[PDB]
């Protein structure tokens, strides 16, 4: 009968609002926190619904963007790489950020990288008795 639901802290909402350039009061922060948590859970349920009908356990970014698209919400761009993005702590030890390395375009522009196609599907029959 006792149950729990992780929610973001007031501090995270105030930190976001700071970038906007507004100093937020106390009640407003909790209001926004609860609203954002509800939206996150709704979107996650919708995303899981699409995965339910495919017989696969991993959840991709395509599923999330599809669920967002059906719910009439703009999509999130820039996270479809299938490779981990490690986080970095700053000097003090409380702020984090993602690594974003500068990249020299002309090197990638002038380079030949032939890709390997895929293989065709086939089915083998396999009988047994018991």
């Amino acid at each position: 009968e006792e149950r729990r639901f992780v929610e973001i802290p007031r501090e995270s909402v105030r930190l976001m609002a700071e970038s906007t350039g507004l100093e937020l009061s106390d009640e407003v922060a909790a209001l926004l926190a609860e609203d954002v948590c509800y939206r996150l859970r709704e979107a996650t349920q919708n995303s899981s619904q699409f995965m339910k009908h495919t017989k696969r356990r991993k959840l991709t970014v395509e599923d999330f963007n599809r669920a967002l698209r059906w719910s009439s919400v703009e999509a999130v761009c820039g996270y479809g790489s299938q490779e981990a993005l490690p986080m970095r702590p700053a000097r003090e030890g409380e702020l984090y950020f993602p690594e974003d390395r500068e990249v020299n375009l002309v090197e990638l522009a002038l380079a030949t990288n032939i890709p390997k196609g895929c293989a065709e599907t086939a089915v083998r029959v396999h009988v047994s008795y018991l």
């Binding site: 017989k55 293989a119 599907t121 083998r124 396999h126 009988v127 047994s128 018991l130």
Partner: peptide, 20 residues
């Protein structure tokens, strides 16, 4: 007179097969 199972397997699908 026990039952007999016919089984099928798909090899090159790569997380794309959904139903059959």
């Amino acid at each position: 007179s026990l039952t007999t199972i016919c089984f099928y397997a798909f090899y090159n699908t790569e997380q794309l097969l959904n139903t059959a």
